Design an enzyme around this catalytic site. Structure first.
Site, PDB file in Angstrom:
ATOM      1  CG  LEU A 105     -84.085 -40.862  86.486  1.00 14.97           C
ATOM      2  CD1 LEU A 105     -85.377 -41.159  87.214  1.00 14.97           C
ATOM      3  CD2 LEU A 105     -83.438 -42.162  86.087  1.00 14.97           C
ATOM      4  CG  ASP A 120     -95.715 -37.320  82.142  1.00 12.92           C
ATOM      5  OD1 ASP A 120     -95.212 -36.201  82.240  1.00 12.92           O
ATOM      6  OD2 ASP A 120     -95.043 -38.347  82.110  1.00 12.92           O
ATOM      7  NE  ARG A 141     -95.586 -38.881  73.729  1.00 11.59           N
ATOM      8  CZ  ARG A 141     -96.675 -38.115  73.814  1.00 11.59           C
ATOM      9  NH1 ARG A 141     -96.810 -37.246  74.813  1.00 11.59           N
ATOM     10  NH2 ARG A 141     -97.632 -38.214  72.894  1.00 11.59           N
ATOM     11  N   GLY A 171     -88.213 -29.230  82.331  1.00  9.17           N
ATOM     12  CA  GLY A 171     -87.175 -29.156  83.370  1.00  9.17           C
ATOM     13  C   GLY A 171     -86.364 -30.442  83.372  1.00  9.17           C
ATOM     14  CG  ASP A 230     -99.733 -35.860  76.839  1.00 12.81           C
ATOM     15  OD1 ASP A 230     -99.684 -36.327  75.670  1.00 12.81           O
ATOM     16  OD2 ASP A 230     -98.712 -35.450  77.416  1.00 12.81           O
TER      17      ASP A 230
HETATM   18  C1  LIG Z   1     -93.545 -35.018  79.997  1.00 14.45           C
HETATM   19  N1  LIG Z   1     -93.811 -36.033  78.959  1.00 14.45           N
HETATM   20  C2  LIG Z   1     -94.582 -35.430  77.853  1.00 14.45           C
HETATM   21  C3  LIG Z   1     -92.609 -36.776  78.529  1.00 14.45           C
HETATM   22  C4  LIG Z   1     -92.550 -38.135  79.219  1.00 14.45           C
HETATM   23  C5  LIG Z   1     -91.210 -38.250  80.008  1.00 14.45           C
HETATM   24  O1  LIG Z   1     -90.179 -37.828  79.504  1.00 14.45           O
HETATM   25  N2  LIG Z   1     -91.244 -38.934  81.188  1.00 14.45           N
HETATM   26  C6  LIG Z   1     -90.112 -39.120  81.932  1.00 14.45           C
HETATM   27  C7  LIG Z   1     -88.897 -38.440  81.735  1.00 14.45           C
HETATM   28  C8  LIG Z   1     -87.810 -38.705  82.569  1.00 14.45           C
HETATM   29  C9  LIG Z   1     -87.896 -39.637  83.603  1.00 14.45           C
HETATM   30  C10 LIG Z   1     -89.082 -40.349  83.822  1.00 14.45           C
HETATM   31  C11 LIG Z   1     -89.196 -41.254  84.837  1.00 14.45           C
HETATM   32  C12 LIG Z   1     -88.426 -42.347  85.062  1.00 14.45           C
HETATM   33  C13 LIG Z   1     -87.433 -42.899  84.366  1.00 14.45           C
HETATM   34  C14 LIG Z   1     -86.731 -43.951  84.976  1.00 14.45           C
HETATM   35  C15 LIG Z   1     -85.716 -44.614  84.297  1.00 14.45           C
HETATM   36  C16 LIG Z   1     -85.403 -44.241  82.997  1.00 14.45           C
HETATM   37  C17 LIG Z   1     -86.108 -43.219  82.369  1.00 14.45           C
HETATM   38  C18 LIG Z   1     -87.136 -42.562  83.036  1.00 14.45           C
HETATM   39  O2  LIG Z   1     -88.852 -42.959  86.167  1.00 14.45           O
HETATM   40  C19 LIG Z   1     -89.876 -42.251  86.657  1.00 14.45           C
HETATM   41  N3  LIG Z   1     -90.598 -42.501  87.759  1.00 14.45           N
HETATM   42  C20 LIG Z   1     -91.641 -41.642  88.095  1.00 14.45           C
HETATM   43  N4  LIG Z   1     -91.892 -40.551  87.277  1.00 14.45           N
HETATM   44  C21 LIG Z   1     -91.132 -40.335  86.184  1.00 14.45           C
HETATM   45  N5  LIG Z   1     -91.370 -39.227  85.433  1.00 14.45           N
HETATM   46  C22 LIG Z   1     -92.514 -38.301  85.672  1.00 14.45           C
HETATM   47  C23 LIG Z   1     -92.564 -37.228  84.610  1.00 14.45           C
HETATM   48  O3  LIG Z   1     -93.018 -37.787  83.385  1.00 14.45           O
HETATM   49  C24 LIG Z   1     -92.475 -37.645  86.943  1.00 14.45           C
HETATM   50  C25 LIG Z   1     -91.337 -37.613  87.751  1.00 14.45           C
HETATM   51  C26 LIG Z   1     -91.348 -36.968  88.991  1.00 14.45           C
HETATM   52  C27 LIG Z   1     -92.492 -36.327  89.448  1.00 14.45           C
HETATM   53  C28 LIG Z   1     -93.625 -36.340  88.651  1.00 14.45           C
HETATM   54  C29 LIG Z   1     -93.618 -36.997  87.420  1.00 14.45           C
HETATM   55  C30 LIG Z   1     -90.112 -41.180  85.854  1.00 14.45           C
HETATM   56  C31 LIG Z   1     -90.168 -40.067  82.975  1.00 14.45           C
END
Ligand SMILES: CN(C)CCC(=O)Nc1cccc(-c2c(-c3ccccc3)oc3ncnc(N[C@H](CO)c4ccccc4)c23)c1
Ligand SMILES: CN(C)CCC(=O)Nc1cccc(-c2c(-c3ccccc3)oc3ncnc(N[C@H](CO)c4ccccc4)c23)c1
Lengths: 303, 303
Positions: free
Chosen positions: A23, A160, A146, A29, A142
């Site tokens: 994703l 986050d 985003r 990471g 934070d």
């Molecule tokens: C760390 N922060 C400062 C940057 C924010 C960020 O980049 N968040 C992020 C990055 C990549 C994927 C996701 C995310 C997505 C997703 C889905 C479709 C398109 C793009 C992004 O879907 C998600 N569902 C649950 N958690 C997500 N991300 C958080 C981390 O921000 C997460 C994932 C797994 C375990 C804990 C937290 C996600 C979220």
């Protein structure tokens, strides 16, 4: 004399879930899209799976585990919760997939289809999650567009908790040390004195609201972070978005008061934005919600 | 003793309209997307502008003008009408823009979003236009999904009268000579004897309906045109589309009877399809109108 945290930490087998696509991969990471299939059940849970860059950093492995502790300790409809951790070479965090990605990107690539109803409803939902975190004695540190994810266009969740901190009953602020917190979302007192409170989070909430109302604009677009402290001290703030009535903009400005206690409480922000959400067009002017002499030929009747 | 055709032919100045983009360019010259701005008015009419390949063919210039005569003589909500002609080096035909292009392409690139209501409503609208043409004593001779245009997804119009022919009061069929008519949409009697009637157009309507129900499939996909005459003679017809109940498929098959008079009349097809349109799911089975054990994480509660 502090409330025992009886959160359960689920340990998942790597065989139980299947990574499907990456994703994204920042300085945190990589996050994977996946399917979690608990063996005994007849279920298939869509999940995001987060792990640090393949190598082991001692200080960074502690921090993931710290983030796991907080996500595992939160239970609320407007807050992303930890489903479990998988104990592989590097530790993996697993949560519910928020398929529509983060809100910041969402508003950017849907400007032309986002009604005032959605905007104000998002504001209510974020304030509810934040208020829940305040109950849970948790200072996010934070909050930004985003860091809010979209489950569906009508249902967003805060996430986050890499910088989050837990406060004691006999404790009202958090004094940082290391720093490297996003400067353009932090309260002045935090920039000056590394102090963080729930009212500091309200400042960030203010900027988050500004982001959404401007459909994803970067706060202080030209300004390098070094300058931010000065301009705020002078009394400069983010401008009034075009779509924003003075009513809404005044809520934003109230979040950015120098006296932190004068700022609104999240419980108050829920009420205010709730009220506004019942009549969204009184509070956000959006053109939709290149010619206007255009007429269809089977209305232009032969003269 | 034949009804004088008092249709008005509007002659447009080239300065009045502005070509904007090419929409397509087949063996029929090019069709342009444009804006027609009559000088005196405060209107701007979106239009398609058709002209033959730059050079002048004597026989082909007669034919455009023949097509102009028919388009200028038709007035009905389900039939595309001529707005005017522009007399430049090569003659230009101008009509109302049908922005969504032709129906064939539309069903192809919207399969996954076309309900049974839309399908049956299209069938009614095409039958109405055709029935109007029958009143007007006009045998289309080129009905197909590709010759029906889309004004909006709910409103389609018949067009492309390059092969159309006008019948006398004391006249019941049309005997062609040149040929080169699309074989896979023509009635058997037309293939064998070059006879064309309103009932021949009903055959074509049948195939047009088959096209739509199969979301744009090419009739007799493998079969070269030379074979078509044989297989029809044997009693072979287009198969029953997957989404089609026997009720609807029976209407199609009735259009393809050997005895032309046994085939349904357009007035009858309007009734039948109308009736069906009031209960579309009784007559077209479409799945929407890869896992089913999938459950959302905030429904899978921690066991
Ligand atoms: C760390 N922060 C400062 C940057 C924010 C960020 O980049 N968040 C992020 C990055 C990549 C994927 C996701 C995310 C997505 C997703 C889905 C479709 C398109 C793009 C992004 O879907 C998600 N569902 C649950 N958690 C997500 N991300 C958080 C981390 O921000 C997460 C994932 C797994 C375990 C804990 C937290 C996600 C979220
Ligand atoms: C000639 N026939 C056998 C092929 C059918 C065909 O190619 N039709 C066609 C080709 C190109 C453009 C159009 C067309 C479009 C259009 C719009 C968006 C995407 C694609 C196509 O919109 C139209 N609106 C009105 N008429 C159209 N075409 C007819 C000719 O079929 C036409 C244009 C101008 C004057 C008379 C007729 C059109 C229609």
């Amino acid at each position: 004399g502090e409330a025992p945290n009886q959160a359960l930490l689920r340990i998942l087998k790597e065989t139980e879930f299947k990574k499907i696509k990456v994703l994204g991969s920042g300085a945190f990471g990589t996050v994977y899209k996946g399917l979690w299939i608990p063996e005994g059940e007849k279920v298939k849970i869509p999940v995001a799976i987060k792990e640090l860059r393949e190598a082991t950093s001692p200080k960074a492995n502690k921090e993931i585990l710290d983030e796991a502790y907080v996500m595992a300790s939160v239970d609320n409809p407007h807050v992303c919760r930890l489903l479990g951790i998988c104990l592989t070479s590097t530790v993996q965090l697993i949560t519910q997939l928020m398929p529509f990605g983060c809100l910041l990107d969402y508003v950017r690539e849907h400007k032309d289809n986002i009604g005032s109803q959605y905007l104000l409803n998002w504001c209510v939902q974020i304030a509810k999650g934040m208020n829940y975190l305040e109950d849970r004695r948790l200072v996010h540190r934070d909050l930004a567009a985003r860091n809010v994810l979209v489950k569906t266009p009508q249902h967003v969740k805060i996430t986050d908790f890499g910088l989050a901190k837990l406060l004691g009953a006999e404790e009202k602020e958090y004094h940082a040390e290391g720093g490297k917190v996003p400067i353009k979302w932090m309260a002045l007192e935090s920039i000056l004195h590394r102090i963080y409170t729930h009212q500091s989070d309200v400042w960030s909430y203010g900027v988050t609201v500004w982001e959404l109302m401007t459909f994803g604009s970067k706060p202080y677009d030209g300004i390098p972070a070094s300058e931010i402290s000065s301009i705020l001290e002078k009394g400069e703030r983010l401008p009034q978005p075009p779509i924003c009535t003075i009513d809404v903009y005044m809520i934003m400005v109230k979040c950015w008061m120098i006296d932190a206690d004068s700022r609104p409480k999240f419980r108050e922000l829920i009420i205010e934005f709730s009220k506004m959400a019942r009549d969204p067009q009184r509070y956000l002017v959006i053109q939709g919600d290149d010619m206007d002499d255009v007429v269809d030929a089977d209305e232009y009747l032969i003269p």
